[PDB]
Amino acid sequence: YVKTWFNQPGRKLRRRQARQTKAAKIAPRPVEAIRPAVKPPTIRYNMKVRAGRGFTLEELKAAGVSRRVASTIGIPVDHRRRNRSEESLQRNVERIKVYLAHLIVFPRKAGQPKK
Amino acid sequence: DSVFGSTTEVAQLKKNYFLPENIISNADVTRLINSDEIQSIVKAAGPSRVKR
């Protein structure tokens, strides 16, 4: 009844391969979407900042990205997190507004019927 | 000089690496004993392997 780690060099490479096979399809677009900056909730860690789950419905409205055009361009949404204070909101608009400033969406061809 | 750096300067390709130093400053200990710093003060020598 043990847990032996002889595969540990192998899961590293299998993860490494499957992280390169993820990028094969998405060759021009990142392997993971942008995550917000949210402060940890305990008294211990409330001065730290780390990546969370997604951008709220009003972090995203204030940046110009609707909740429907959000997950197309790779922006996670968290329908559960809410912006209690401005600082939680002003820090994360500058996550989106830099992301939209650095991102180039390729256009598409439409289906307007002719004649 | 950027992988190991120096003895008092950080190697650039390694965070917080300084090359070690020595417990003996001169790497050659049978050539201090024969110096002028030691053989001026030492007491009068005895002989080699003594007579029986």
Binding site: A62, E86, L89, Q90, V93, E94, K97, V98, L100, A101, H102 | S2, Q12, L13
Partner: peptide, 25 residues
């Protein structure tokens, strides 16, 4: 060996111009 809320909800960062000419392609 290598050698404040009114101005953020309105102003955006620039186009972040393109280097190495393939992201400019």
């Amino acid at each position: 060996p290598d050698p404040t809320l009114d101005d953020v909800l309105d102003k955006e960062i620039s186009i972040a111009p393109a280097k190495t000419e393939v992201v400019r392609q």
